[PDB]
Amino acid sequence: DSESFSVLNWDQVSRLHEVLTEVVPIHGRGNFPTLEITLKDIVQTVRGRLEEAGINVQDVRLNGSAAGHVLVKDNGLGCKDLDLIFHVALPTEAEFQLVRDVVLCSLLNFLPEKLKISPVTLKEAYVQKLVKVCTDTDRWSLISLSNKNGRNVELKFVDSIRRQFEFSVDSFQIILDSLLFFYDCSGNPISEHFHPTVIGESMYGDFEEAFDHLQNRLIATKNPEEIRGGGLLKYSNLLVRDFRPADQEEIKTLERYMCSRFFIDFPDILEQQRKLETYLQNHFSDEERSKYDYLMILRRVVNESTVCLMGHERRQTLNLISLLALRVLAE
Template sequence: MCSYSSSPPPLTPSTSSNGGFHFTEYDSTTSHRSSPSSTGGGLQQTLTFEQVQRLSQIVSDPIAINAKEGNFPTLAISPAQLIKAVKKRLDSKDIDVTDVRLNGSAASYCIAEDRERSPALHYNDLDIIFMIQIKTKMDLHIIKEEVLNSLFDFFPEGTQTGRISSFMLEECYVKKMVKVSTVTDKWSLISLGDINGKNIELKFVDSMKRQYEFSIDSFQILLDPLLSFDDARSGEMSPVKLDANFYPRIQVTSLYGDFGEAIDHLNNRLISTKNPEGIRGGGLLKYCHLQVAGYTVADSAEIERQEPYMCSRFFIDFPSSNAQYGKIYKYVFSRYLQSQQPRKALEFLDVLLQVVGQHARCLMESERYKTISILCQIQSVISWQASFCQGPYFPSVLQQQHHPSSPTSTTIIHHHQPQWHTGHMHHHQYNRRGSDSGSSNSTSSSLPMIHFPHSTNNSLPVGPTPTPVR
């Protein structure tokens, strides 16, 4: 079994670019700062008993939270336990939680009629949204501290935690951390997970303009009724049993705007979105991923019109070659390589090459060629490693996966409004926006090498060298 690295291999100097600009997370023309009562007709439905059972299992099954380094223990935490622990601590700090929601692919898994055909069958992340009211600038910092402190509740009994600081917990357990504070968007995200990529992502939202990419992941399920029912079930005096005649009434909402249309897209494997220019990255990578998963477009003419917008927003959010390379490789790793699907990864890159080649009209020809070279470089690395694992060296490949520890990924965004263009964007328009905060000083040496499998044979084959961009 191949041991793929979650960090991209070094980008060849010939494809590096110092130009670029930095933008905030989400942008759209429609705000989704809503409460349960704000959803109108056609936007929500009530879960059936079978769907409630499915939801109960999702929030009850424990997830392993692995430490990245040190002697810290692996924590087995169910989402329901973590939600209750975090809510209790936030209440003690006078931070009001309006409601808690399950979002994204896990929510889609709960309501899909045919889960065998749904991509949500293989969901990795549990996206939990806490709808809150941020009153002061310190609230987001307090939220982070209380989430980290809540992990103490799940340490093995007898663990001496007196000398463990929240900073140490962050370094050991947090995989990703994002804080966005703009005029229209105020939210933060803390991601916890295991070494196999199963994550719990806690998102604390005061306001967010765009909370979904495609109609099939636009569903949000209110968890508060189930959590209250769960408390009643575990009561010592009068435990309550979940059955077909007595179960909580739980609402599911579609932010797509038309619940019936969104559920039809989910059950029939159809691709549809609105205003892709308002999505971080334009939804470009997920659009290609859905095609690889066997999805078809709901409206060919509409999607063809939207593809240039997807490309335009992607290259605005990831303008430099290093930014594009890192984003694409990490997406490929989390979706395919981590689950040992190199052929699917190559198929995904083929689809992405086709879309970029045909619809990235926002780029000059030379810039588009650089991006195509990046995709070809990733393809060649994956192709070589896949053939290496399946060739004569496969028996000597160590079965033990190598998971190098990595620092917490932290993003902080303040008061920058993203801008997007489609059609023919000229080169001087690209450069006029300033430089990407992480690209102008980045070099290929800052990107770690890919970790190839070990072999007892000392004469390993050399991987292919991509053709440099001139």
């Protein structure tokens, strides 16, 4: 109900406007130039061309750390990743290809003025990753832009997705539809005296409770059973950023559960290595000290919250953590 929603104030709406209008460079591989895009322009292009092609855009939302930064300035979670969500129905395969073609066309809008241009070519030049699932329980397409700039622009087109786990401070989404309608129809720039009503939502459950957690830098969750192997990595990211567990005397039980879930999802040691290496690159680029501190946090949780039955997995994972941290110190 309304307990998960909240109305943004001018301070939050203003920072939302800066995030959507910030010029973000998108690195181009090869002879391709860097695209200077804004979240506002790419949303308007994608949503316009989607609805023009028969795909109704139910709503557009800002997700991730950016949504947290709009609610609380400099909360400690950073502002690298710009995550966008497009609630669109994807019944058949043709809708999935249409979503890709519209995104690649949106990149063509920012391409300045000799190169060969095509959908296959634009994907190679600017799309960092493109994952796609198409089952009865999950139907969503994700397109990420090149992150050699340092920032991660993710375009997530969700039809239906079973709820993913995140802590309170990472569960904020900002519905942009009222502000996008304002961008198209306003004759004056957005101001304190004239600005639309922007709504934020916490997928955690209670906005005020989650908002208080972000204001006091607290680690909390109400659905621990939905935690999978990645939960240990999200929890360690909050710890390295000076977020304290909001419920002491309970974190020991939660840390043990997160280590067990980590080992169940990643039994192979070579699988844990590739998961950490890609995690250290997509979260702590140009932050070698943060790479070391994150691994040392991860070592402390694994060393103190792994049961006696899994001593093999504990020693094996602790050794991998040390060798990854040693390679950071070796450079």
